[PDB]
Amino acid sequence: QIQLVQSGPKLSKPGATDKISCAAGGYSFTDYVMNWVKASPLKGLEWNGSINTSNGATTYISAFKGAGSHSVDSSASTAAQQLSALKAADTAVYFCARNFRGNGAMDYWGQGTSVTVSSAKTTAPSVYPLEVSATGSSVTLGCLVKGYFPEPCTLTWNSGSLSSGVHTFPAVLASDLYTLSSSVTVTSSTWPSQSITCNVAHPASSTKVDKKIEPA
Amino acid sequence: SHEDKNPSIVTIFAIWNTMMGTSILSIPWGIKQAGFTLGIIIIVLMGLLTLYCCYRVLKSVCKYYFGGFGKWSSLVFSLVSLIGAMVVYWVLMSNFLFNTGKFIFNTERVICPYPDEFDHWWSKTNTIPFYLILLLSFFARFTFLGTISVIYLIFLVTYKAIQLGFHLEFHWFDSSMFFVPEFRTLFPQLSGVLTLAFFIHNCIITLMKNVRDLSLAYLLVGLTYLYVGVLIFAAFPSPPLSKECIEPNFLDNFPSSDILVFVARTFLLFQMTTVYPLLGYLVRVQHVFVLNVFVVGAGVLMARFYPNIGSIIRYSGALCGLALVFVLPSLIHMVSLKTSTLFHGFLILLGVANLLGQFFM
Amino acid sequence: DILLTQSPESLSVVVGFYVTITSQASNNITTYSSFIFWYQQKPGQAPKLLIYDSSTLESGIPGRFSGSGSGRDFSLTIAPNQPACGATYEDLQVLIVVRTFGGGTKLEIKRADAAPTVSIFPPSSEQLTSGGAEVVCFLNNFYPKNINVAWKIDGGERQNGVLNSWTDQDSADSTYSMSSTLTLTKDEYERHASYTCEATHQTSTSPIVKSFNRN
């Protein structure tokens, strides 16, 4: 089972550096090439440089010579890319990929590292449960997560049991603070008769909070 | 082929066709292992050095100088050349059969083969019909297939490069994904191949029995090797692929169904089969068929476990070339002298660093 | 550097129909076989390889994805369209030392029109006690993407301090959803009683209004 697992989201301060990793399980590491790719607002994919691990031979795109630095660890079968002195324009998602010489393209990819280049300091979120305002058929009830930074923010309903009827809207920035909201629509049979909770986790501020939706 | 009354012209031709054969297939991989520039230098020097040591053999079972530890010593290393060549014949007939047959079961590409329902990949399906034949020689009636293979093979290589051949860049000591450095630390691996490729010493005495002749012969031979080596290394599509992909049998950098290569493989298969039995008469002349099934068994076993043309040729050539090409012809000469000593010791040292440099990996 | 120009910019295909994304390369990307590749990327997820060497199908990809092309012009075709295909698709060239991608094609699956399940939510008291109050308003599972929400505080169209978010198109429903959180102060929230979440869409000429009174 070919698996590429990269690093966690990074909040690097403007002018600092970070190293992104990519642990490769499921194939013989050297029999393939490791590439790196950049995705920036909605559309715009850029090749970024790449390295044949057998002879340690990297090859970059001119645009990225001097930002990206490839390296590999043959024993750990991981690949690492260092980015240096970042600016606002370097806030992007970085992907890790896999190439065999020409007999294909980039067949297996990585989950993606999201680097956020900013000086706003990590603030933890405020979770507020959105109780329903009368009911009839089915009730949608919600949950508002307001005022957090950086963006890796994970929200589950009923610890994941409730996977269906969910709408986890993406985050927006207002005055260097994000706000996220989520809705779940269930039957008048199922609520308030059962327990429904908004589970919010901001790993970056070591914040794990649960918030139950109540009628008042 | 391989290692082992004339009006000079036919003498040079004969030395050429004898040293030509499946030996030329590994040259591209050798350059790649040293780097391009450093490899070219090595090919020239190693051509010149082996020529001097072949001269030396000409100026001389010999080996009275040593006796016992000399008579036996010449035999074992001469046996190393012979039995080592009977092994690589086995592997290459397998690959060529495999592709020659896979072709005739009912393609312009270059392949980076993944290193290791049709069951047509067997080296045992040829030992059964091919082992009695060396108990018997007449097979020398088909030496023309040696030239036919070499003729068609060279035609093949030129046709290919004309089609796709403009890809070079010069990363001198750094590396690129697609290009290897020009000076690579694996330069010893190239030297080992060349020793076995540049070896006629075991039979140059009988070959020259019919010196300007020899110099043109290795020059023609030496220049023949440099041609194939450079075309395949340069024409290897390098922006899309990489020059680290060059397989030790460069015909394996091509698919199972390259028609031109299949013609070359069929021709090489035709020629190669008409020459293995001779080595069986050759090995035993140097009382059951136990020895003689021993070399046959050695062929089959090698192709099924470790089938790299590159490692086999470099080790065997450096081994038998330690004595038969480097030290012994230099020892024969120096003792026969009952500044030059320093030079000839340096030749002795190269033959030593040749073998030791193959272990460094 | 090979510049790849991919069209359409944005494409809309009805479910069950055929989508023909196209790519054109500046230079030649054929070495001895063509070296363009097609990729699929759903929101927030890594890219997926559909067709390699312009016309060969990757193990596991549905045969409804087909590829053709050589030299300069290439096309990608999804012959029966499925809502699991609501993604953005790009093309890649692997032939020359600077590797380049394409403009991207955002495929939107046209489904039957559906109207929003609009639901309004008063400020949680846990916030009012911390100061501040926002009226969230979910508009879920609708089609098409375009929609307008007009917050009205005691009838007065208040458009200051509204903040929206849309979902990408559902991989199964082929629908969209939106959350409009109108944020006020605790003080200003208690200066008014009516809070309406007036939503207009293609489905109803008369806006679907969900409202509440503070008492």
Tab-separated table of N, CA and C in Angstrom, chain A residues 2 4 24-35 50-57 72 74 79 97-108, chain B residues 112-115 177, chain C residues 58:
chain	number	residue	atom	x	y	z
A	2	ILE	N	1.054	1.871	-1.138
A	2	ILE	CA	1.939	3.027	-1.229
A	2	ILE	C	1.352	4.181	-0.441
A	4	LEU	N	2.444	8.062	1.272
A	4	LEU	CA	3.281	9.232	1.541
A	4	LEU	C	2.608	10.085	2.619
A	24	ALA	N	7.641	7.804	3.481
A	24	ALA	CA	7.147	6.968	2.382
A	24	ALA	C	7.152	5.506	2.804
A	25	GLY	N	5.964	4.911	2.949
A	25	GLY	CA	5.841	3.488	3.212
A	25	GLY	C	5.133	2.783	2.068
A	26	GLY	N	5.557	1.551	1.787
A	26	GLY	CA	4.870	0.706	0.826
A	26	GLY	C	5.618	0.374	-0.444
A	27	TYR	N	6.794	0.946	-0.673
A	27	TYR	CA	7.566	0.611	-1.862
A	27	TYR	C	9.045	0.823	-1.568
A	28	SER	N	9.898	0.267	-2.427
A	28	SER	CA	11.328	0.491	-2.271
A	28	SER	C	11.637	1.930	-2.665
A	29	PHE	N	12.129	2.697	-1.685
A	29	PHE	CA	12.256	4.156	-1.786
A	29	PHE	C	13.089	4.604	-2.989
A	30	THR	N	14.272	3.998	-3.175
A	30	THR	CA	15.207	4.429	-4.215
A	30	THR	C	14.763	4.042	-5.621
A	31	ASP	N	13.859	3.077	-5.761
A	31	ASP	CA	13.442	2.680	-7.097
A	31	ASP	C	12.501	3.718	-7.729
A	32	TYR	N	12.369	4.901	-7.124
A	32	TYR	CA	11.432	5.927	-7.568
A	32	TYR	C	12.045	7.304	-7.313
A	33	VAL	N	11.387	8.331	-7.848
A	33	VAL	CA	11.795	9.728	-7.719
A	33	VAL	C	10.793	10.464	-6.833
A	34	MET	N	11.284	11.354	-5.964
A	34	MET	CA	10.417	12.198	-5.137
A	34	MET	C	10.388	13.601	-5.704
A	35	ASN	N	9.198	14.119	-5.962
A	35	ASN	CA	9.027	15.459	-6.503
A	35	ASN	C	8.287	16.293	-5.459
A	50	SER	N	12.918	18.436	-7.702
A	50	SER	CA	12.742	17.008	-7.486
A	50	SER	C	14.096	16.318	-7.440
A	51	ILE	N	14.122	15.125	-6.851
A	51	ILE	CA	15.375	14.477	-6.484
A	51	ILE	C	15.285	12.982	-6.733
A	52	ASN	N	16.270	12.452	-7.449
A	52	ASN	CA	16.433	11.012	-7.559
A	52	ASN	C	17.305	10.555	-6.409
A	53	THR	N	16.715	9.757	-5.529
A	53	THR	CA	17.364	9.405	-4.278
A	53	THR	C	18.548	8.469	-4.474
A	54	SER	N	18.544	7.678	-5.556
A	54	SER	CA	19.614	6.708	-5.780
A	54	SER	C	20.971	7.401	-5.925
A	55	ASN	N	21.019	8.524	-6.653
A	55	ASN	CA	22.257	9.275	-6.848
A	55	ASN	C	22.188	10.677	-6.249
A	56	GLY	N	21.229	10.915	-5.349
A	56	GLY	CA	21.029	12.180	-4.651
A	56	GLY	C	20.914	13.428	-5.515
A	57	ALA	N	20.443	13.275	-6.736
A	57	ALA	CA	20.595	14.296	-7.761
A	57	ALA	C	19.320	15.121	-7.869
A	72	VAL	N	17.095	14.002	0.964
A	72	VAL	CA	16.420	12.740	1.270
A	72	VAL	C	17.208	11.989	2.334
A	74	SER	N	17.931	8.180	3.104
A	74	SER	CA	17.734	6.825	2.582
A	74	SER	C	17.360	5.818	3.663
A	79	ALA	N	11.556	12.090	2.662
A	79	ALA	CA	12.023	13.171	1.819
A	79	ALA	C	11.745	14.475	2.549
A	97	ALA	N	5.201	13.989	-4.047
A	97	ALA	CA	4.714	13.075	-5.077
A	97	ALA	C	5.799	12.050	-5.393
A	98	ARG	N	5.539	11.214	-6.398
A	98	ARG	CA	6.346	10.033	-6.678
A	98	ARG	C	6.345	9.771	-8.166
A	99	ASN	N	7.530	9.596	-8.741
A	99	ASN	CA	7.720	9.452	-10.179
A	99	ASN	C	8.667	8.288	-10.407
A	100	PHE	N	8.336	7.411	-11.361
A	100	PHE	CA	9.289	6.470	-11.951
A	100	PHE	C	9.689	6.994	-13.327
A	101	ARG	N	10.952	6.783	-13.722
A	101	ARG	CA	11.449	7.521	-14.885
A	101	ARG	C	10.609	7.268	-16.123
A	102	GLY	N	9.717	8.212	-16.386
A	102	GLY	CA	9.025	8.283	-17.645
A	102	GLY	C	7.917	7.293	-17.883
A	103	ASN	N	8.011	6.054	-17.328
A	103	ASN	CA	6.970	5.015	-17.525
A	103	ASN	C	5.667	5.433	-16.927
A	104	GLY	N	5.679	6.633	-16.382
A	104	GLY	CA	4.486	7.249	-15.899
A	104	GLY	C	4.762	8.671	-15.492
A	105	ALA	N	3.877	9.138	-14.628
A	105	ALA	CA	3.918	10.453	-14.039
A	105	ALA	C	3.845	10.301	-12.527
A	106	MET	N	3.258	11.298	-11.883
A	106	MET	CA	3.194	11.360	-10.432
A	106	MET	C	1.958	10.572	-10.003
A	107	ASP	N	2.179	9.296	-9.648
A	107	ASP	CA	1.077	8.353	-9.439
A	107	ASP	C	0.506	8.436	-8.023
A	108	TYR	N	1.364	8.471	-7.013
A	108	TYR	CA	0.930	8.581	-5.633
A	108	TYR	C	1.434	9.893	-5.058
B	112	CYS	N	13.254	2.190	-18.492
B	112	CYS	CA	14.013	2.057	-17.257
B	112	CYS	C	13.439	0.849	-16.524
B	113	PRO	N	13.988	-0.343	-16.736
B	113	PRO	CA	13.344	-1.562	-16.228
B	113	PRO	C	13.288	-1.584	-14.707
B	114	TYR	N	12.130	-1.950	-14.164
B	114	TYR	CA	12.040	-2.110	-12.718
B	114	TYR	C	12.947	-3.271	-12.337
B	115	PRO	N	13.927	-3.068	-11.466
B	115	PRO	CA	14.833	-4.160	-11.107
B	115	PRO	C	14.085	-5.285	-10.413
B	177	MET	N	18.714	15.536	-11.732
B	177	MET	CA	17.855	14.357	-11.784
B	177	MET	C	18.128	13.539	-13.036
C	58	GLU	N	-4.899	4.870	-15.649
C	58	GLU	CA	-4.236	4.426	-14.434
C	58	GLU	C	-5.076	3.359	-13.742
